[PDB]
Design a protein around this ligand. Structure first.
Ligand code: MG
Ligand code: MG
Lengths: 782, 133, 120, 68, 62
């Protein structure tokens, strides 16, 4: 094996920002690289548009104009000339540029302001696309990536991408089919779930069921493809049609691709446009809405390397090819899910029975605590109702965090006290057994169905364990699987930690006086790790959610099965002495014919059921196509359109007020700290500003220092429902609000939802506010 | 129907008649997480174990008190007005419907003491909303 | 009554079905969701006996039926009055089959007898 | 005229006091349970041996909604 | 911004005006704004119209 594409699974996220480098973002290629970066700009800024518009001037433009200032309200071919000169037609439709110079009458400033206005209207505050860069790496006499391909004169690389969306063709998402799949257990899912029927898999009917026969259902699939090479950096759109080919048809931009002269491919997702074929078809279900399409997609990434000496190298087999999937935006990019999609890859390789042989370092346990700690910025329960996060604050306040790194007997009760609060993914605790036919009924807090029964609830006898998030089994009141547990292999790490059976280096201990100091240390370990290919593979996936799956945010339950990978091997620690959950070489199973596969349009008839998944396990079986992905297969499971599923991915209220359960808050926040509040605690009393923290200079400085600092903390503590950061149907007199209007309105309002970004507090004084806060920006403001 | 009327702008949130039908209240759950001083000789202090509460710095202890004090809950959420449960619709109309039975379970605000506010910034008299408890 | 082609060719696959009133957990507490009653009537007395249960069981009385025996020994069984109701007025029955918080006075059950001749 | 037949339901002789009066299949029922119930020695066979309430429990609750 | 065809006009060589109404296209500015009231639906427009018809006659003698 000679050349390989990284990452093996690339991720690009939709956004209404433009598909150009200066105004877009890049999928992480190193884990934890920007966690505290207070200069991040995830929304298009005025300054970026102004720079873009300056860049587009002269060029001779200044005196190509001034030349007709003398030669005179403009003409067409007068203006047609002075458009075009600014290469701005690829950002705004040509006509609207013309209409903007029409209402005109120093003139190379009436020209700018008029053009800035149209750029601003289209893009100001827009959700920047998160594009994925793909790289070719030269390999070894062992398939080990050594260095990126360096093109010399005469060398050429050609990328090919083929993507599809089959959501409108596939089945309803009622719950994860693998919840009933017979298993011996993996690192991601205990055999107890299926063995004891904790959350039975449901049957699922077809989406768009009125379209009958396989031939006609092919129209429900959106697909496109394109090629780019290192000899031409022109961007190529990936454009399909829905329905595909007196049928009214819609163009769907599934993505855009670019290759630079060094041979690196950049993949942009769509613009975030979802639509029904009729305006009156409303998307009132979280996952299954007929007559709808969206611009999400996924598919196959290949390349061919042409060296000058004639040598040609095809990157097409599943060991060296790659995949791409597009997803909803990440509305808090610096806030990591507690269990990531990379954790699912890692867990998929492990057997539940062998978790006794797992070896644990503290760096394998720290991510759980660090991620849960940082959920405070997106979820109220983790800010004010999480006893572990408050204990971490206790330790931080006396520079005592390093005690958690102590594996000795004197710290055992400290470690155990934290470990004992976490939910056990065996799902066999806090239960009473009917008929020890056996049913496991939770004696902790359940999450009720909306379908009420006016009968007294059974009092909970056992505390609610951590984390406080719903899970795959939410449909079943009293199932332990209603609530999320870190997966078996990660729980094993934490159990080994509690027991004291873990190692840690002295150097780690010396950077561990607070959780932030240690997180900064580990971030440097990623940054300096020399395996850029595998770090890039992990970084693509460590920002994605890895549970619960109902269906999820980006991808869903098939990813937690080793069946979906053609390769999944441990390679190494991140650092010789520091594992940090490790680096792995993994590749998806792929159908090598791509869009031309005869299995492109397979299904299981009127329903899908776990029996079909059971039959697919055998790779020689007729049903094994389920795991050998063709374009569209990773995302077809997800909600159609994604916006409704995102609006449904929020809080699930219990009769008890607190803690408020939240589904996926790290990527779809539930409770955020608005910009309005940041502007009321940002400043110190000494600030040289006529307005300080929303007060007149005179009032801010007249109050006592203690009172001034108390007001800061009060503002800092006001967290706003993320669903209220744009108009989701609750605005206005007698507005209905409610769940369903959220689903409907998210189709247009997703691009106006608050985006969380790290920001500085220069002098918190004794206020208790950290120097880096995570602030939610939306136009609802303030 | 006598509650908030949201504008496109987030803040200030308009409220109709909040003195008699409150809109955002300070729940008992939060009161029980700031009413105690760090010297309290109890196994649980402000919702923390004795060991954790007394292990932290005095500054951090007071900061936690004020954070809890600052958590205000929508009064409409102090009983089940149609928003509870998986895929509950919630919304304005269910509130109207459910209040016929749930009015008697809505939170009732009562003055309560903070014996030793210390330097927390919490006043010696706070007004706390009790519901179901 | 049913051809083997329906199942064999997957013409209408059976669906999974969740529990009604799913917020009532544990078999012991779900027993409250069952309404039941019994009675006896004899040849010697034609007084009508109601079959009256409660919902939730051990709060509304549910008349599931009435029974009568005439001096000839024939039993006459009357069903209920056709009263269906939710435990809360705001719980509306918007699904064709599955509405939580609802009860009705439909029932079915077991009919037995003993014949006591004069010779013992 | 399609004939006359002698037929009788399977009955649990304990009726309201049967230990299977309150049996179910857990969080969902599925055809798998019915398949298992075919075997008269299975822990699912009780499905066919009716206790009071077993004939009408499948129907719509309340019946009026189903009728509409 | 939406284009609304309110009608079409034709005149023949005899001088008779023929007036066609629109195509019957009604629409809201957002697809989620549904017209649930018999008469008053915000955010909606239709292609109905009415207005003023005038003419000038020009004879060959001026
Ligand atoms: Mg995130
Ligand atoms: Mg009052």
């Amino acid at each position: 094996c000679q050349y390989k594409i990284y990452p093996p699974l690339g991720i690009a996220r939709v956004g209404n920002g433009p598909a150009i480098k200066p105004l877009s973002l890049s999928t992480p290629e190193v884990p934890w690289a920007h966690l505290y970066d207070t200069n991040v700009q995830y929304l298009v800024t005025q300054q970026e548009l102004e720079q873009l518009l300056e860049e587009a001037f002269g060029g001779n433009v200044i005196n190509e104009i001034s030349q007709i200032k003398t030669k005179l309200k403009f003409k067409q071919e007068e203006i047609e000339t002075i458009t075009g000169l600014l290469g701005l037609s690829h950002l705004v439709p040509q006509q609207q540029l013309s209409r903007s110079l029409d209402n005109l009458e120093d003139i190379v400033q009436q020209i700018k302001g008029a053009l800035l206005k149209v750029l601003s209207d289209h893009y100001l505050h827009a959700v920047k696309k998160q594009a994925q860069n793909f790289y070719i790496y030269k390999c070894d006499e062992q398939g080990n990536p050594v260095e990126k391909l360096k093109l010399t004169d005469g060398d050429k690389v050609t990328w090919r991408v083929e993507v599809a969306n089959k959501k409108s063709f596939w089945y309803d998402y009622n719950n994860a089919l693998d919840l009933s799949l017979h298993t011996q257990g993996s690192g991601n899912l205990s055999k107890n779930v299926s063995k004891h029927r904790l959350a039975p898999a449901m049957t699922a009917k077809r989406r768009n069921p009125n379209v009958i026969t396989n031939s006609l259902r092919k129209q429900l699939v959106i697909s496109s493809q394109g090629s780019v090479s290192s000899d031409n950096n022109t961007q190529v759109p990936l454009r399909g049609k829905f329905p595909a080919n007196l049928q009214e048809r819609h163009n769907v931009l599934q993505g855009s691709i670019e290759c630079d002269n060094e041979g690196v491919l950049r993949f942009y997702a769509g613009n975030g446009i979802s639509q029904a074929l009729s305006p009156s078809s409303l998307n009132t279900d979280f996952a299954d809405n007929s007559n709808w399409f969206d611009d999400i997609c996924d598919g196959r990434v290949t390349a061919v390397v042409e060296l000058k000496n004639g040598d040609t190298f095809e990157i097409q087999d599943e060991q060296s090819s790659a995949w791409v999937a597009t997803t909803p935006p990440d509305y808090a990019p610096q806030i990591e899910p507690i269990v990531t999609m990379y954790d699912m890859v890692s867990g998929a390789a492990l057997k539940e029975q062998d978790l006794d042989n797992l070896t644990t370092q503290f760096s394998d346990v720290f991510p759980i605590l660090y991620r849960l700690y940082r959920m405070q910025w997106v979820n109220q329960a983790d800010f004010t109702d999480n006893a572990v996060n408050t204990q971490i604050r206790e330790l931080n306040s006396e520079l005592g965090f390093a005690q958690l790194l102590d594996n000795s007997a004197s710290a055992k009760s400290l470690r155990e006290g934290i470990f004992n609060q976490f939910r056990n993914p065996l799902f066999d605790q806090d239960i009473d057994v009917d008929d020890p036919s056996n049913e496991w009924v939770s004696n902790s807090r359940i999450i009720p169905s909306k379908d009420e029964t006016n009968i007294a609830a059974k009092p909970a006898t056992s505390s609610l364990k951590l984390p406080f998030y719903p899970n795959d089994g939410i449909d079943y009141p009293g199932s332990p699987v209603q609530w999320f547990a870190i997966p078996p292999f990660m729980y094993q790490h934490l159990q080994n930690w509690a027991a004291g059976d873990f190692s840690v280096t002295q150097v780690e201990k010396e950077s561990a006086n607070t959780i932030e100091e240690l997180g900064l240390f580990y971030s440097e370990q990623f940054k300096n790790s020399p395996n850029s290919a595998l770090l890039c593979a992990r970084g693509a996936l460590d920002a994605l959610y890895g549970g619960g799956f109902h269906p999820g945010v980006e991808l869903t339950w098939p990813m937690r099965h080793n069946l979906i990978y053609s390769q999944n091997d441990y390679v190494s620690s991140v650092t010789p002495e520091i594992n940090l959950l490790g680096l792995r070489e993994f590749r998806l199973k792929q159908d090598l014919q791509g869009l031309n596969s005869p299995n492109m349009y397979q299904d299981f008839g009127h329903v899908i059921a776990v029996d079909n998944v059971t039959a697919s396990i055998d790779p020689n079986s007729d049903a094994a196509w389920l795991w050998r992905s063709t374009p569209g297969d990773l995302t077809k499971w997800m909600g159609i359109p994604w916006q409704s599923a995102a609006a449904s991915c929020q809080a699930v209220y219990t009769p008890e007020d607190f803690p408020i359960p939240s589904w996926w808050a790290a990527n779809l926040p539930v409770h955020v700290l608005p910009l309005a509040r940041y502007n009321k605690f940002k400043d110190s009393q000494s600030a040289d500003l006529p307005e300080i923290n929303g007060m007149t200079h005179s009032i801010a400085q007249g109050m006592s220092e203690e009172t001034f600092e108390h007001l800061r903390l009060e503002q800092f503590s006001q967290r706003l429902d993320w669903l209220h950061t744009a108009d989701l149907g609750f605005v206005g007199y007698h507005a209905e609000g409610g769940y369903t209007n959220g689903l409907i309105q998210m189709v247009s309002q997703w691009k106006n939802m608050a985006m969380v970004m790290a920001r500085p507090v220069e002098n918190p004084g004794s206020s208790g506010i950290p120097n880096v806060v995570y602030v939610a920006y939306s136009q609802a403001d303030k």
